[PDB]
Amino acid sequence: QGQLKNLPFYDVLDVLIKPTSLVQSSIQRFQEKFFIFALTPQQVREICISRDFLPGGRRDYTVQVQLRLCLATCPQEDNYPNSLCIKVNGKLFPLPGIEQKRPGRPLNITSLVRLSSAVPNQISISWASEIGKNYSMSVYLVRQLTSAMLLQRLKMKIRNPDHSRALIKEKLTTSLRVSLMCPLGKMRLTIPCRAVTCTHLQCFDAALYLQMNEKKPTWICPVCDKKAAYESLILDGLFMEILNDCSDVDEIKFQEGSWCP
């Protein structure tokens, strides 16, 4: 209870505060709760040496303290309570009526964190309750990953050319036409990719798809607009073979796994 969905661009290094119910008075609308964590000496050093270019162009800590809120039992997306107000060591953390419907995201609170092991850090959370909607907070130490990093990991996880040949033949059992260009970026595919759930043969470029979700993480497949989560992604060996053999060719027709332009 209170566990959140995995974020593909973060590695969890530690749980600083385990999922914890934000208990509400039933009588008063507005609520406030305080939480303490304390970094170890090695965690402080971890943050301090971690600075690098982030997306946006800013140099900052890539090892971060990340606060997440969600409804309360299975893994949930980030969701905020009505009138959420967060203070960290007394300083207000700006966030990036009855029906507040604004979508939650993880909060990088590192820049208000006291980078010390001798002194505890403190977080205050205020909110206004809503009937039959219960929330939970947790705080993690995370390393933010780039798209290159996700790409690399994705490479270490690729699909037999024969799998797609059987979909070709178990589909045609006229002519099956497919493009070698990215529907996202319009240039020639470099690393061809789709979700295992996708029933189409058309691929998209892994690197460019992960660059887009790095900025605005929607995880929607550009070909068919179904869910295309990071963990569902595969790289098609067949389209990789075809890419190393073609040049100046944009589209191909498959027959009963042969292929012409």
Binding site for Zn ion (CB under 5 A): 198, 221, 223-224
Q: Which of 186, 178, 149, 184 is nearest to 236 (CA)?
A: 178
3-state DSSP: the chain helix, strand, coil percent, rounded to 5?
20, 35, 45
Residues 8, 154 contacting (CB under 8 angstroms): no
Is residue 193 a known part of a binding site? no
Packing angle between helix 147-155 and helix 206-215, nearest 10 degrees?
140
Is residue 200 a known part of a binding site? yes
In angstroms, give the least distance from the CB of 167 to Zn ion: 13
Q: Which of 61, 57, 49, 56 is nearest to 10 (CA)?
A: 61
Looking at the Cβ atoms of 150 and 228, the one nearer to Zn ion is 228
In angstroms, give the least distance from the CB of 213 to Zn ion: 14
In angstroms, give the least distance from the CB of 201 to Zn ion: 10
Looking at the Cβ atoms of 93 and 239, the one nearer to Zn ion is 239
In angstroms, give the least distance from the CB of 255 to Zn ion: 23
Looking at the Cβ atoms of 172 and 196, the one nearer to Zn ion is 196
Question: DSSP character for 111?
Answer: G
Is residue 224 a known part of a binding site? yes
- Give dist(CA 238, CA 82) in Å, integer: 49
In angstroms, give the least distance from the CB of 195 to Zn ion: 6
71: amino acid identity, one letter = L
Looking at the Cβ atoms of 141 and 238, the one nearer to Zn ion is 238
In the structure encoding, which two tokens stand for residue 82, read together?
Answer: 């009505």
Looking at the Cβ atoms of 158 and 224, the one nearer to Zn ion is 224
Residue 212: C-alpha distances to residues 55, 167, 185, 218 (Å): 11, 28, 11, 9
Binding site, annotated residues for Zn(2+) = 198, 200, 221, 224
Binding site, annotated residues = 198, 200, 221, 224
